[PDB]
Ligand binder design. Structure first.
Ligand SMILES: CC(C)(COP(=O)([O-])OP(=O)([O-])OC[C@H]1O[C@@H](n2cnc3c(N)ncnc32)[C@H](O)[C@@H]1OP(=O)([O-])[O-])[C@@H](O)C(=O)NCCC(=O)NCCSC(=O)C[C@@](C)(O)CC(=O)[O-]
Ligand SMILES: CC(C)(COP(=O)([O-])OP(=O)([O-])OC[C@H]1O[C@@H](n2cnc3c(N)ncnc32)[C@H](O)[C@@H]1OP(=O)([O-])[O-])[C@@H](O)C(=O)NCCC(=O)NCCSC(=O)C[C@@](C)(O)CC(=O)[O-]
Lengths: 460, 460
């Protein structure tokens, strides 16, 4: 008897207590007004000083989740971290997270860390569902943790960084149930974005190539997903094709907001090119002029790009725009970006609005690994229902974002420079007033002579 | 309908074509004769020049496996790498392995990389079984890959390095079936061995602490495993305790061979301390003098250590010794060490001898993460059976090891120094005669100006 409706029961997001404003950053970088706020679609970018690291981000979000829902230590049977922020080549963040469990005597917890660029959180989610449905499940919850500190050198990528983490409690009878058998996955060997300079926080990135690879992976994953759901539909006696009309919401890994608007447009072009001649003429009149073009052309053909943005605007506004709130206010937090979009979706809509819907999700990691998958939302939206509890837990997201402190581009730059200076340092205590951290935040208190990191927690 | 007897169908091992002799290394290091060959129990240590890296090791073992069993590209639905040899902080070895699959059009392959010290291979194995038993299984095989290049600076740890990789094909109806529900797992936050110097290949290691942590994890995992199997036995109407008598073979992560002899002894001490007063007097006469001591004392008490080695000698010879052949001749290859012991076990015994048996397995990774689990071997040992095929595939292991070239400690040291020199280099082709590689070996042909690695393959 495989457990039913395996999925997300609870979700917690963490982001740092300061950001740099994109309009300010434009002026600081001497670029044209609107290049970041309109061109990239970004409003504010969160960032961390050396006082926070991947361990402290994950400790913070996990302990906050457990405290909020009063989760017993003995109730977690799997705990796994997805990240691409590596501060130790052998020792997993999972082992550090055991600080939260081991003293209580609960150390029989499967899972370690798993990495490929921005895809590791999804890998951990899939692993958790796989475990829970297997002969190895022991009735306990799984906890999926992901997070990252996304930083670039001064230059055109710097405004697309960010930072944060997400923890998700996975269990049976979940209000956001993973739709079984529907993982459209695509992996291939590319060099769009990678981190081969082991002593640098910075990736090597080919911006244009990374955008092309994200979109090609989207094409492939969407095709795989459609094939799989159509096969299920056929078995159930329906020959209809899957299109964006079959998704009520659609969320994406979000390196910047404009990327996602273009990505929803790319999905519509896929629907169009896959549609019958009749359907094309009936539903896609504005796209008929482009019936002979290729998916890849949405990136090079300006008339096509514009037509697609126009044609998909309503769907974007209805299915995707709300999910971008955290991203536009915090930036790209890599593995947890997609899950921050899920949080934003939950924060915007009522349980009654979400009830019974399908949420499509696209996860990408450069290099590359990608999956398109979906959740089915419970029909039960009554007060006190699992769905109501989940939705309610996210409602204060905009207030939380608003409580952060704006930092000048000058000071932000100094803090980034400090990250470079301290990257490899030992025997030191990270500078910074702990009063500038949110209550309950774990932080790096000291790196000792032997490069061992010690953490402390701001009360509350 | 969950698939039956999920487990290992095929196993491939790769190790480099040269080793340094431990007796020679003793003389080179000016250490007492026998310190390495007797003290550590090591005979020869495999090593790689800069011409081989974690990607090339994994490409080699995967392609060799697929060619030997003529595995169709479309037959693999999950592929995941466990390793602690990190040469890119974002881009997974899995993505590079897609070079073997993507041109054939099979890119819908779940899995990425997973890391914690020497435990990642096991994590990948568990993830593969979990996937295969879940709603996400699509009928295809999983492939578990692990490998590592284990190197230390000049000093007392250097003789306990090694290198290699293993690929395992996982599927239903396997001749080595994972015993369901029997994973005794223990994770906790320690600093016994870790790699915080991102630009160095070398770990920070506290040797004594690492030995203590391995043994403590062994205690915890064995206790967890015993509890779980005893619970299954109780449900089946049996109250008897599990002991080493219930294992026909017992294989371990092997940092060096002496460690493993002491580990089997530690398990016997656990049986003894857990046994009834009556059982103690009947079966453990030589241990009664120590009935008041603690598990941890096997490391500090010489009388106890000696008594345990003597008392467990017969069990060691029968259950564990044969499994150490590859380890004594190749060294510690980290994540794939345990699985090399499995290969050694298969190479030594006939299918008829193994048929129907239980193989216990202990996997450890510093930091730490550990699991004690087991396999049930098929009863079918007829010629051409899955078990016969698996066993036969390993029979030439000693011949393969014997075909390697012995390199002087002087030249070995130069090659290690060269690894340090070239670690971060770009825009170069690794020196070394490709004729010194085994046929069919992938190797690093060039690292370009953008730190992109290009691989080539020695024919056959
Ligand atoms: C994204 C790039 C490449 C941009 O770098 P860029 O050099 O600024 O490119 P650009 O000059 O084309 O500018 C971008 C946009 O601003 C517009 N623009 C220009 N001026 C104005 C103005 N005055 N007013 C209004 N708009 C303006 C401009 O025209 C354009 O929009 P478009 O026309 O293409 O629709 C850069 O920031 C970068 O390289 N970022 C890092 C890579 C990345 O984020 N790639 C995304 C896909 S890959 C992925 O998401 C994975 C990732 C990155 O998370 C990593 C991982 O998996 O680990
Ligand atoms: C293992 C150590 C600490 C040893 O380094 P050492 O302590 O300097 O050597 P030693 O002086 O302790 O001698 C060791 C053994 O040789 C004996 N000996 C001495 N001289 C002679 C002689 N003339 N003739 C015969 N025997 C001799 C000696 O007495 C003893 O055996 P014992 O008495 O304890 O049974 C070192 O090599 C090291 O630190 N290695 C790396 C760490 C390691 O392998 N630890 C194992 C457990 S942790 C684990 O396995 C994880 C790992 C390491 O793979 C990492 C990962 O998870 O990623």
């Amino acid at each position: 008897s495989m457990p039913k409706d395996v999925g997300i029961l609870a979700l917690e997001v963490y982001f740092p207590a300061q950001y740099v404003d994109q309009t300010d950053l434009e002026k600081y970088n001497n670029v044209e007004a609107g290049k970041y706020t309109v061109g990239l679609g970004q409003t504010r970018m969160g960032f961390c000083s050396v006082q926070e690291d991947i361990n402290s981000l994950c400790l913070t979000v996990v302990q906050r989740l457990m405290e909020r829902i009063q989760l017993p230590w003995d109730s977690v049977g799997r705990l796994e971290v997805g990240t691409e922020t590596i501060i130790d080549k052998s020792k997993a963040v999972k082992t550090v997270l055991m600080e939260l469990f081991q003293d209580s005597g609960n150390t029989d917890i499967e899972g370690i860390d798993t990495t490929n660029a921005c895809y590791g959180g999804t890998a951990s989610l899939f692993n958790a569902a796989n475990w829970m449905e297997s002969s190895s499940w022991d009735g306990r919850y799984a906890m999926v943790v992901c997070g990252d500190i996304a930083v670039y050198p001064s230059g055109n990528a710097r405004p697309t960084g960010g930072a944060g983490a997400v923890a998700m409690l996975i269990g049976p009878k979940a209000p956001l149930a993973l739709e079984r058998g529907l993982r459209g996955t695509h992996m291939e060997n590319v060099y769009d974005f990678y981190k081969p300079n082991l002593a640098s926080e910075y990736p090597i990135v080919d911006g244009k190539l990374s955008i092309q690879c994200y979109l090609r992976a989207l094409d492939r994953c969407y095709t795989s997903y459609r094939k799989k759901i159509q096969n299920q539909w056929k078995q159930a006696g329906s020959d209809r094709p899957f299109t964006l009309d079959d998704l009520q919401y659609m969320i994406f890994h979000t390196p910047f907001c404009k990327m996602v608007q273009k990505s929803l447009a790319r999905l519509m072009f896929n629907d169009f090119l896959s549609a019958s001649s009749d359907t094309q003429t009936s539903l896609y009149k504005g796209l008929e002029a482009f019936g002979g073009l290729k998916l890849e052309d949405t990136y090079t053909n300006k008339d096509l790009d514009k037509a697609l943005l126009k044609a998909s605007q309503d769907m974007f506004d209805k299915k995707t725009k709300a999910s971008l709130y955290l991203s536009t206010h915090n930036g790209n937090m890599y593995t947890s970006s997609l899950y921050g979009c899920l949080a934003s979706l939950l924060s915007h809509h009522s349980a009654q609005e979400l009830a019974g819907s399908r949420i499509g999700a696209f996860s990408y990691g450069s290099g590359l690994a990608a999956s398109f998958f979906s959740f089915r939302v419970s029909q039960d939206a009554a007060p006190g229902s699992p769905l109501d509890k989940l939705v309610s837990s996210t409602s204060d997201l905009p207030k939380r974002l608003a409580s952060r402190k704006c930092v000048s581009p000058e000071e932000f730059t100094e803090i980034m420079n400090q990250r470079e200076q301290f990257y490899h340092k030992v025997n030191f205590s990270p500078p910074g007033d702990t009063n500038s951290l949110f209550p309950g935040t774990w932080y790096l208190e000291r790196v000792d002579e032997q490069h061992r990191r010690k953490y402390a927690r701001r009360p509350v």
